[PDB]
Every structure is written in structure tokens, then in C-alpha cells.
Design a protein around this ligand. Structure first.
Ligand SMILES: [Cl-]
Ligand SMILES: [Cl-]
Ligand SMILES: [Cl-]
Ligand SMILES: [Cl-]
Lengths: 107, 107, 106, 106
């Protein structure tokens, strides 16, 4: 038996770029590290400016670049300067002790 | 094989507050206890006034406060006074015994 | 790996009712035909308006043909709309393939 | 604990058809390339209109290049739209990493 719970949250991630025709969210690899989020992990991305809510996967950005970029169709759901929260969830046995989320506040 | 089934439902939760620039959904910890919903658990939140449907995670509110508050980008999807249903699911092997959902009706 | 795959689909379910101030209520015989159980999570997609939502199943009276959207979901349909109702299961992709139970109501 | 990670991505799939009164049909050789199986749940995202949906996969004829949105999903695209089609898997992250299968149809 499993339930979904918060694993990681990055708060106040400022969008630095967007690329519709990408060759999904790019995040500074050091921020990913702080948040215990791995390459290709599924995340929920929510936008404080426009209210958009979406799910996509993570691409590594360059370490210490502060890159936060929405690529592909997700580019249509933001603009540069928007503030995001980026959330990862995990499925756990509810008979186990509670998971303590990793919280990263970029503000 | 595993399927998702209803584990908990809080019905007719009235929004008492909203804060866009939070430092998700805040629920009276006593109400959470009645519904067997734990802090940081993922929930579906559906709004009877405006029809909005979203997924977020639970933050504890003060016991017996009747606080129901949508924080962060979710704040853009409600107004004070709106009536919510708050739902949590669980993944189970359906060859096991049925999950009997915990139903909390606040109306 | 664990992946999600289709386990049941009810096609061309016609909305018979909606009640804002109550989920999806489905004739219990149709549920059995689809191998969908009470309180199971389902995807509901609407051919008339394109709406897509997830909710849980409530039993309707057997052989009533009841298909009703209740609660906030009521704002996402009207009586007479045609729905597809889909349930998924998580399984090992290398183990024997799941044959979905398909129920066509047209 | 389990987390969801990318397992398969088809990029720049051009919509060739849509049929409301039949959900995504994909050339079965493209599916094989992407390690996507019949009835697998997929995320479909549209570069032209920004729409994001979840549905399941139906086999199309091999080497046809068919990419067709069926059912209510038909209301969320037009012929010629470019799609990305994504599948995820739940894994124990302390095991070895899933190397995603990437198929670029551009
Ligand atoms: Cl995207
Ligand atoms: Cl939020
Ligand atoms: Cl609902
Ligand atoms: Cl569909």
C-alpha cells in the first residue's frame, strides 16, 4: 500500500530562459543537488505570476548558473522573470515513518 | 498489479485565507486527523464555486482553527468563502481487502 | 520498472445527471463489466466539450444506466454529454501484458 | 520510496489525423524505438497550442508515421501540430538510473 507525499520543493525559482523548439525544465545542477532532485525526475511546476500548473521532467543546467528554463511546450506557460515553485513527490508505505521534505528557498 | 483508490475525503471545507507569496493547502490539524491525512501528503483539491481542480500538498494549520488556506500559486485558483473538497488516494493491490475511505463532512 | 497501463475503458457513457452540491456515479452493472470498483480513481474525458478530469467512482443503481458527475465535476459537463471513463493500473512492463476490459455503451 | 522518472520521449511527432468519435495512435515502429508498449499511459504535449494531456497508446501501422489523436483528445490538436510524447516509470532511486529512450522525429 502506498501514498504520495512531498519529497522536495524549490521555492522562488526565477525563470531565466524559455525555448519552445528544444533539441521540460532546465535547473542549475547545484540547485537540483540541494533539492535532492535528479536528472529526468518528474516534477510539478507551479507559477506565481500566472497560476499555471504543469508536470514535466528535469534537465541539468550548468552548476551555479542559476538557470531555470522552461523548454518545449512548457515555454508557452511562462515568461522570463516569472517565479516558480518546483515540487517532487514520492510514493511511500504509510506504515513507515514520515518523509521529511528537502526544502530549498531561493528568495 | 496496483490501482489508485480513495483513502480520505474532506467535504465542504470553506476557504478562510489565501496568501500568494507564501514562505500549497493549510488545513486545521484536527480536521486532518479526522481524515487520516498527514502533513506533506499529496491531495487533490476541487472547488465547488469555480470548478478548479488541482493537486498540491498539505501543511498543518492550528488545531481547531478551522483554517483552510490556499497558499502559493494555488491562491490564484480560489477566493475566500469558496467551498472545497479535499481528496487523497492510495495505491493498493486490489486482490487485498478494500480500503474503506475516511469521510469528513464539514457542512 | 513500474509503469501505468490501461486496465478498463467505458466508451460512450451518456451523462444522465449532475449534482453540484453532493465524483462520478456509474450504474453498478457497468462498473462490474469494466472491472472498476467503488472508490477507484478514474480519468473522465468528455467528447462534447473536451474536458479531462480525474475523480473517484460511486455506485449507481444496477441497470439504471446512471452516469452522473457530482460535486465540482458537475461544472465540467452537461446532461447528454458522451464520456469515456478510463482506469489505469501500475505493473511490471516485462511481466505478462494486461488485456484491458473494454465496455462500449454506444 | 518510489519516484517517477522519464523512461521514453518521442520528439517532433507531427499529427497526421484526428478522430473524435473513435487517446493516441502511434506507428508501431516508432513505439518500438521509444520502448513504448500498446496501452501504455503517456503524456502528450503540443508545441503549437501548448495543450498538455494524459492518454494511452494505440498501435498504428508499421512505418506509416501515423500520429493520431482519437476521442476527446481530438479537440486538443489539429493536423500538422508537433507533439512530444512522454512516458514515465516509478523506480526506487537507490537502484541504477533509468537511461531514457529518446526518439527525435524532426
Ligand atoms: Cl513540455
Ligand atoms: Cl501551489
Ligand atoms: Cl469532483
Ligand atoms: Cl481522449
Amino acid at each position: 500500500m502506498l501514498i504520495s507525499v512531498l519529497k522536495s520543493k524549490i521555492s522562488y525559482a526565477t525563470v531565466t530562459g524559455k525555448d519552445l523548439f528544444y533539441v521540460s525544465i532546465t535547473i542549475d545542477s547545484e540547485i537540483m543537488k540541494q533539492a535532492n532532485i535528479i536528472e529526468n525526475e518528474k516534477v510539478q511546476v507551479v507559477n506565481l505570476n500566472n497560476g499555471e500548473r504543469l508536470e514535466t521532467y528535469v534537465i541539468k543546467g550548468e552548476p551555479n548558473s542559476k538557470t531555470i528554463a522552461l523548454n518545449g511546450p512548457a515555454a508557452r506557460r511562462c515568461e522570463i522573470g516569472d517565479q516558480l515553485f518546483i515540487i517532487s513527490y514520492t510514493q511511500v508505505d504509510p506504515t513507515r515513518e514520515n518523509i521529511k521534505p528537502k526544502l530549498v528557498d531561493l528568495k
